[PDB]
Design a binder for these strands. Structure first.
Length: 756
DNA sequence: ATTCGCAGTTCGCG
DNA sequence: CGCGAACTGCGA
């Protein structure tokens, strides 16, 4: 089982290292045969010997073209001939690719920015994380000394913790009366003990939470100041600190450093992303946190250090338990994308699609387009029109059926052959025309992406079917992840089409997909209304809520089935409308804001404030409470009662303070905010302290009773405490709880005045 | 660094 | 005072 790839240099020549685990034993494969290359396209074969003789310099050295071969390749389905420029060293490239391209007789250069190790996995057709192997894992966390006004590190590591299958233990250099804490003499001793256990345990996966930008990194500077060699790698190497854009990432060679924070952020939507918040969310088990002022105080006073060691032990524990929950999903994703878990787990949606397409492009001898240059990126600032949203029939409804297409946009892509290699292709026998936008798509042959999307969806149904048959627990659950992982990749293609940074960018493909979807949803709206007498309450992009006004639950149900049988006969290709569910009642505030109640009594919510993270827990809890009353019981007077109830508890300051917190993320440099909002103003003052504000940092603030703008009365909740602070009861009652619950009962004639 | 469509709050300008 | 720009996150 191939875990990762990289290369070392031996006598100036690159040596691929294939890190594997084969039947429980870590192994390293070496390849010195692989040669770095990129492609060049030129007007005449006359400049090739002129193109062989170009020279550059990387580091006092002189880089030359090792060899040349010219290959017949396809470009967007069209055949072409490019020169393959081999080189001595993987880094020979970047130094000389610009020089070759500025050559007037070269038209362009292709596939010049593929990392050697990743290029190796593609060209050699090797799949990472493919196999049945069980990986030994080890999670770890650290505790540190912090003075409010001081730079990074320089303030020792008080304790280091780790967890695995056997349990969780803490290492520290003071004495703590806890059975799971190992005591050593010094911080230097504590660090060295941690190096020994990792080597002793020899884990394939090192699980951290934000170790990329803190946990790991501290350890090095402390290791450097204390004269310690940080031999964490399987080849005795030190962790690799690398720069990933704004933030940083850490490698550990021979092992997979599995930082949960990036994978947790992309996978889940949480109001806050502290370790306790993620744990409470995933496992429903609460974890309390000891703040940094508490740990430094405790350490210097020698107060309950038991409390700090219990917290630090739980950090490692939940990190391991979270790592056990998310590694397989992330591992199967790597098998799909064909890249290392390390690279896959830190990759955005766009990178994952492109790494997949690049592997497939290589297989189909399809030369890969380049990433757009700066000016060519500017010509992609064009925008197009997307899904269709019907203005709802606002109010309360009964006997509501929901019908949507199965994977609308993927179905459109394969059915109509939506692809840049087929868009406006000439000389074909059969074409599909996209409505409104009018683009033609050749259909004589399968488009590059449509063929990939077809086999993807075909494979998923095969995994899904194999799933139910499998006797094995663990193969079955992994099969669930790969199948579900194929779903997310399959639905990423349309957005990829409109992504300006995509190699395979095609705005025409993007607006063609959206155009068909609008006609398919609207044509279906009219058919169900005109020929079956249904009433369509609400339709958003790929589905609609419909009812027959004066009908029984069984009548609307069975009639809806008959409509399905009828339009599916009229539905081309893989497009199919399905019966998603039936809901006894539903309430629709406006576009994107609605909720429904099924037969079970379970309530589904969309776009309402209960879903929002920038709305305090309390207006959501109240909005959920009223929503339940009329959806579950129909008791409108009970719904004004709970609002009445809540409103007086805010007025009397009985409501807990944590309910009143409102979490709003910072989306950019603070300097570039044209307007200053409450979360901005808060963030801005923390900036005027030791804390630094990173885009994507969540600010949790509370509004206090005071005079002025809401931004001038907001403090971070951590520094809020009732001794000197009285929260603003009126704002939460006037701007929060009522406005949310003053978007659904107006239809019942109620006004905020009826709820104070 | 997938896309567009969208409701609503906070703030500042006239 | 009304209104729109700025802003965030939602559904899909």
């Amino acid at each position: 089982m191939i875990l990762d790839t990289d290369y070392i240099t031996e006598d100036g020549k690159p040596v691929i290292r294939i890190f594997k685990k084969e039947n429980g034993e870590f192994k390293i494969e070496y390849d010195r045969t692989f040669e770095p290359y990129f492609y060049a396209l030129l007007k005449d074969d006359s400049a090739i010997e002129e193109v062989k003789k170009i020279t550059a310099e990387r580091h006092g050295t002189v880089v030359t073209v090792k060899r040349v071969e010219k290959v017949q390749k396809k470009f967007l389905g069209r055949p072409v001939e490019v020169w393959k420029l081999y080189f001595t060293h993987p880094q020979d490239v970047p130094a000389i690719r610009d020089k070759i391209r500025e050559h007037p007789a070269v038209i362009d250069i292709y596939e010049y920015d593929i990392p050697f190790a990743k290029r190796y996995l593609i060209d050699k057709g090797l799949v990472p994380m493919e196999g049945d192997e069980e990986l030994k894992m080890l999670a770890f966390a650290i505790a540190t000394l912090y003075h409010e006004g001081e730079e990074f590190a320089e303030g020792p590591i008080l304790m280091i913790s780790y967890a695995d299958e056997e349990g969780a233990r803490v290492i520290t250099w003071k004495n703590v009366d806890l059975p799971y804490v190992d005591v050593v003499s010094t911080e230097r001793e504590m660090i060295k003990r941690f190096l020994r256990v990792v080597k002793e345990k020899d884990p394939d996966v090192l699980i951290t939470y934000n170790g990329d930008n803190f946990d790991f990194a501290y350890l090095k500077k402390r290791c450097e100041k204390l004269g310690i060699n940080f031999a964490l790698g399987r080849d005795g190497s030190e962790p690799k600190i690398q720069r990933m854009g704004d933030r940083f990432a850490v490698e550990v060679k021979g092992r997979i450093h599995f930082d949960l924070y990036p994978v947790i952020r992309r996978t889940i939507n949480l109001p806050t992303y502290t370790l306790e918040a993620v744990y409470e969310a995933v496992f429903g088990q609460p974890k309390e946190k000891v703040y940094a002022e508490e740990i430094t105080t405790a350490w210097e006073t020698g107060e309950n250090l038991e409390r700090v060691a219990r917290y630090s032990m739980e950090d490692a524990k939940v990190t391991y338990e979270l790592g056990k929950e998310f590694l397989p999903m992330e591992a199967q994703l790597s098998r799909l994308i064909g890249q290392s878990l390390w690279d896959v787990s830190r990759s955005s949606t766009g990178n994952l699609v492109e790494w997949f397409l690049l592997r497939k492009a290589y297989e189909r001898n399809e030369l890969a387009p380049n990433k757009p240059d700066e000016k060519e990126l500017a010509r992609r600032r064009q925008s197009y029109e997307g899904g269709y949203v019907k203005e709802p029939e606002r109010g309360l409804w009964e006997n509501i059926v929901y019908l949507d297409f199965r994977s609308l946009y993927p179905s459109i892509i394969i059915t109509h052959n939506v692809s840049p290699d087929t868009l406006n292709r000439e000389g074909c026998k059969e074409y599909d025309v996209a409505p409104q936008v009018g683009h033609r798509f050749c259909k004589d042959f399968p488009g590059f992406i449509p063929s990939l999307l077809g086999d993807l969806l075909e494979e998923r149904q095969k995994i899904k079917k194999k799933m139910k048959a499998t006797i094995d627990p663990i193969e079955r659950k992994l099969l669930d992840y790969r199948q579900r992982r194929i779903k997310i990749l399959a639905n990423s293609y349309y957005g990829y089409y409109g992504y300006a940074r995509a190699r395979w960018y095609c705005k025409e493909c993007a607006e063609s997909v959206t155009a068909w979807g609008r006609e398919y949803i609207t044509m279906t709206i009219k058919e169900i209304e005109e020929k079956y007498g249904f009433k369509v309450i609400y339709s958003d992009t790929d589905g609609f809520f419909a009812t027959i006004p004066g009908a029984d639950a069984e009548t609307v149900k069975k009639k809806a089935m008959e409509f399905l049988k009828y339009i599916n006969a009229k539905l081309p290709g893989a497009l199919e409308l399905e019966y998603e569910g039936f809901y006894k009642r539903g309430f629709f505030v406006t576009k994107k804001k609605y909720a429904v109640i099924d037969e079970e009594g379970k309530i589904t919510t969309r776009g309402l404030e209960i879903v929002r993270r920038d709305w305090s827990e309390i207006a959501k809890e109240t909005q959920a409470r009223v929503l339940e009353a009329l959806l579950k019981d129909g008791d409108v007077e009970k719904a004004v009662r709970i609002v009445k109830e809540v409103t007086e508890k805010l007025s009397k300051y009985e409501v807990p303070p944590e309910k009143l917190v409102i979490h709003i993320q910072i989306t950019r440099d603070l300097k570039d905010y044209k307007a200053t909002g409450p979360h901005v103003a808060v963030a801005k003052r923390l900036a005027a302290r030791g804390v630094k504000i990173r885009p994507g940092t969540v600010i949790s603030y509370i509004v206090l009773k005071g005079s002025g703008r809401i931004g001038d009365r907001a403090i971070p909740f951590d520094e809020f405490d009732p001794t000197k602070h009285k929260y603003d009861a009126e704002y939460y009652i006037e701007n929060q709880v009522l406005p949310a619950v003053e978007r659904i009962l107006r239809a019942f004639g109620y006004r905020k005045e009826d709820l104070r």
